[PDB]
Design a protein around this ligand. Structure first.
Ligand SMILES: [Mg+2]
Ligand SMILES: [Mg+2]
Ligand SMILES: [Mg+2]
Ligand SMILES: [Mg+2]
Ligand SMILES: [Mg+2]
Ligand SMILES: [Mg+2]
Ligand SMILES: [Mg+2]
Ligand SMILES: [Mg+2]
Ligand SMILES: [Mg+2]
Ligand SMILES: [Mg+2]
Ligand SMILES: [Mg+2]
Ligand SMILES: [Mg+2]
Ligand SMILES: [Mg+2]
Ligand SMILES: [Mg+2]
Ligand SMILES: [Mg+2]
Ligand SMILES: [Mg+2]
Ligand SMILES: [Mg+2]
Ligand SMILES: [Mg+2]
Ligand SMILES: [Mg+2]
Ligand SMILES: [Mg+2]
Ligand SMILES: [Mg+2]
Ligand SMILES: [Mg+2]
Ligand SMILES: [Mg+2]
Ligand SMILES: [Mg+2]
Ligand SMILES: [Mg+2]
Ligand SMILES: [Mg+2]
Ligand SMILES: [Mg+2]
Ligand SMILES: [Mg+2]
Ligand SMILES: [Mg+2]
Ligand SMILES: [Mg+2]
Ligand SMILES: [Mg+2]
Ligand SMILES: [Mg+2]
Ligand SMILES: [Mg+2]
Ligand SMILES: [Mg+2]
Ligand SMILES: [Mg+2]
Ligand SMILES: [Mg+2]
Ligand SMILES: [Mg+2]
Ligand SMILES: [Mg+2]
Ligand SMILES: [Mg+2]
Ligand SMILES: [Mg+2]
Ligand SMILES: [Mg+2]
Ligand SMILES: [Mg+2]
Ligand SMILES: [Mg+2]
Ligand SMILES: [Mg+2]
Ligand SMILES: [Mg+2]
Lengths: 130, 155
RNA sequence: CGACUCUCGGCAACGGAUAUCUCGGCUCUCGCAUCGAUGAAGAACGUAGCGAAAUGCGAUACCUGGUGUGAAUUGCAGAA
RNA sequence: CUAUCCAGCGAAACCACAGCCAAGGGAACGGGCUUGGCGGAAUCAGCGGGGAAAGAAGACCCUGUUGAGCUUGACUCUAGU
RNA sequence: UAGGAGGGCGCGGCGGCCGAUGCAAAACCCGGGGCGCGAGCCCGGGCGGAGCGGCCGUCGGUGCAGAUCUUGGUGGUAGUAGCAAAUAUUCAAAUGAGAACUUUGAAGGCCGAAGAGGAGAAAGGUUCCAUGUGAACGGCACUUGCACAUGGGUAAGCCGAUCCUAAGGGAAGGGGUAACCCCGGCAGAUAGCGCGAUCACGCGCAUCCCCGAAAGGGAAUCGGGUUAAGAUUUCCCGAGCC
RNA sequence: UCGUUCGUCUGACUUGGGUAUAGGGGCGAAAGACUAAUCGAACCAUCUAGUAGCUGGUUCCCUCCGAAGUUUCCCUCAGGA
RNA sequence: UACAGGCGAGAGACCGAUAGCGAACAAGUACCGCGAGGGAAAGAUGAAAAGGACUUUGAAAAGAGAGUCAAAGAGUGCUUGAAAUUGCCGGGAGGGAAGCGGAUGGGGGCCGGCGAUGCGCCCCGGC
């Protein structure tokens, strides 16, 4: 149960916050989980998903399909992954939509900012357990 | 989509329908009613004769005001009937469409007969007219839905 | 046998009730004290590669700059 | 020229349920009740007897401790002089 | 009957208890079976596709047939009343899926110029012109259009406005006013000073500011050409004028 | 509104535009006429859910009990105690 | 101490699209009035547009096949989808209303907890 009398526990406000969040806020909301191998290696559970990351679907009808992130299409709360597609009636091919909370990031697109971000998150999870 | 009726033998049936057609529901209802159970070749010629004002359509439910004529004497003794031209043309469109449907499948065109013809009212469209003393009254149309099924006659 | 009228049932229409919802409303409580001649509130006209409205902005015109974040915007096209 | 008949288009008023009469009784002039006369599908064009037909919470009259326009020797005031 | 009371039924929340549901919740549908004197209730079948129910206590915007009730939807009337002023159309051909209604030609008629002709002021605002077009709309119809869509189109020293005053309006100092506001002749170093001068000074200051007419007053233009749509005088050619 | 028929037509004539008068006020060759289909006091909003002894309506079941149109007073007689 | 405005919050035995503010939506909008002013209606496909290629008839709109989907009969005003009223198919009845209450007779339609086959003595032959 909440203690901070500045955070709202109302269904109406919490939904408004979610569905009217700006782009800089959807990056955190559309966050994915590290794989078992990476969670073991970086000591972080989950990260905000990036353009060139590699994922594996773990819940959809496409469960067990791996691929590369090709678009983090924040305006629809979705990511398209390479070759995760279906064909339209006319025969054209379209990329199907995946929510970041139903994939695991099997490989990281690491940068200077990502390395620092992994550090800060790793410094944290240890700072409570120890 | 779904018709009011299942074809008695669906393999030897062709079907046509049209929705929201701007023709009078009442006249179109009488036209269809007088066509039911006819063989197709008689159906096409009967309707063409009404268009050429040579045969008539009896009016039975919606008849209050309709004039009397000698042509409809064989079927309606009280002589009351008309020649709804626009109704006959619309049905000829769908009758020919269902005939084309059958030739695709492979039915015996000369063995076909109207197994089911149905007219239903559609959403009325609105216009308006002007009456004395600065008043407005509705001036509306009564469009109809038509669905038909031709079936091969069995012995 | 039929037509018409009334009626029962099945199917199909017409219409938008009901149910299930809800970034809205209403009510209560709390914090704070900040318009203008240095031109306000309000009004007008413009402004986007493709826009009419709403939203935003002012010939630097759906923005310029700084700072934070850290890889998108997206209906299509293009520099990338 | 309409009305009339045809192709096309296409309203509204009104509507408890309805719609053949005679007498009786009845809120003292019934379409329905009582007792009689009768009474046979479905349709077209007219007509103005009836529906105490429609239109409009009678404008006449009365009531109300409801008004308002106007008048004056009504009561109480008031600008002006 | 008017009226009073008791015991129940039903609806939606809250505190508690006991439960159903993707092996199909709610709602709705039925010539399905039952229970209760009744309010109502239980089950079957179907439809639907994610929520719901019973019991105790407690609470309320809690039960409809009426109110010329409110809003919405729907009938009969009824394919009916009706489409009848302004004299009038006809033949061929073209087009087109389709022609009484479009187009060309021919014929027959009308307005008869205080016109059914040619141009403007007000008012409108793109209706103007070309190209195309499914629906709707043009109370029949349409290939069509004053509709719809996409484009195009309004050129001035000389036409106007603009300048001047009319009736009249607003107005500074002043007078009134609780203040918003109301008063312009009341006469105040009245607003503005004007003119000659600059190389500075002089003179004079009288009935005085602004607004108010695309029909009053008023600097100046004519002819000939030109577009799908602009011009008689805005563009082109020539010739003038203020 | 339309048809025919009528009144007047050098005048106290017809008419456009501008301007003045605004609600117990205007304006009236006077009809209580006209003041935007509104006039014996316009229209708009508010006070305002104005008041009504008067008309209309007033939503589930069963069971039990069950009337009054009479007295007195009231500007009281369609009302109330 | 006050605080229907402003800005920033947090709650609720409140309403659930005819309710709640007039406005959940390009709502003080469209539209009306010379004006002061008046003032609406209108939310919901699907998990994902995967929003229906192609063939055939038609001038077209569309239809019939097909394709997508768990589903389109969820097909761009698309969750569910009531009633009034309407069409078709099947059945029934009718001499100037119909409907209604009690009876029953004929048809339908439906009902297997709609309606039982078990219990006591016994003789084995095994548990
Ligand atoms: Mg007639
Ligand atoms: Mg009028
Ligand atoms: Mg006719
Ligand atoms: Mg009699
Ligand atoms: Mg009577
Ligand atoms: Mg009798
Ligand atoms: Mg008879
Ligand atoms: Mg008659
Ligand atoms: Mg009569
Ligand atoms: Mg009456
Ligand atoms: Mg009365
Ligand atoms: Mg009295
Ligand atoms: Mg009085
Ligand atoms: Mg006196
Ligand atoms: Mg409540
Ligand atoms: Mg209530
Ligand atoms: Mg009701
Ligand atoms: Mg009642
Ligand atoms: Mg007629
Ligand atoms: Mg007439
Ligand atoms: Mg002349
Ligand atoms: Mg034109
Ligand atoms: Mg038309
Ligand atoms: Mg001037
Ligand atoms: Mg002038
Ligand atoms: Mg002039
Ligand atoms: Mg020149
Ligand atoms: Mg006359
Ligand atoms: Mg004369
Ligand atoms: Mg004359
Ligand atoms: Mg005049
Ligand atoms: Mg004048
Ligand atoms: Mg008088
Ligand atoms: Mg009240
Ligand atoms: Mg009374
Ligand atoms: Mg509302
Ligand atoms: Mg509203
Ligand atoms: Mg389904
Ligand atoms: Mg569905
Ligand atoms: Mg759903
Ligand atoms: Mg639906
Ligand atoms: Mg129904
Ligand atoms: Mg039948
Ligand atoms: Mg009976
Ligand atoms: Mg029986």
């Amino acid at each position: 149960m909440k203690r901070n009398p500045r955070v709202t526990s109302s269904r109406r406000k919490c939904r408004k916050a979610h569905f009217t969040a700006p782009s800089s806020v959807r990056r955190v909301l559309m966050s994915a989980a590290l794989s078992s191998e990476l969670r073991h290696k970086y000591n972080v559970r989950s990260i905000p998903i990036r353009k060139d990351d590699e994922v594996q679907v773990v819940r959809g009808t496409y469960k067990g399909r791996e691929g590369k992130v090709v678009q983090v299409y924040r305006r629809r709360w979705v990511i398209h992954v390479e070759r995760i597609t279906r064909e339209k009636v006319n025969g054209s091919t379209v990329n199907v939509g995946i929510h970041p909370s139903k994939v695991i990031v099997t490989k990281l697109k690491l940068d200077k900012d990502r390395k620092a971000l992994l550090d800060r998150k790793a410094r944290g999870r240890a700072a409570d357990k120890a | 989509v779904k018709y009011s009726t299942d074809p008695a033998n669906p393999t030897k049936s062709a079907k046509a329908m049209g929705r929201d057609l701007r023709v009078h529901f009442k006249n179109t209802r009488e036209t269809a009613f007088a066509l039911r159970k006819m063989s197709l070749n008689k159906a096409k010629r009967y309707l063409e004769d009404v268009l050429a004002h040579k045969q008539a359509i009896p009016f039975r439910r919606y008849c209050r005001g309709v004039g009397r004529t000698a042509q409809v004497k064989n079927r309606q003794p009280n002589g009351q009937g008309r020649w709804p031209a626009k109704s006959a043309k619309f049905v000829l469109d769908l009758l020919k469409n269902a005939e084309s449907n059958a030739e695709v499948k492979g039915l015996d065109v000369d063995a076909l007969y109207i197994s089911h013809i149905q007219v239903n009212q559609a959403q009325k469209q609105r216009r308006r007219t002007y009456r004395a003393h600065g008043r407005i009254n509705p001036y509306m149309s009564n469009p109809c839905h038509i669905e038909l099924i031709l079936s091969e006659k069995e012995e």
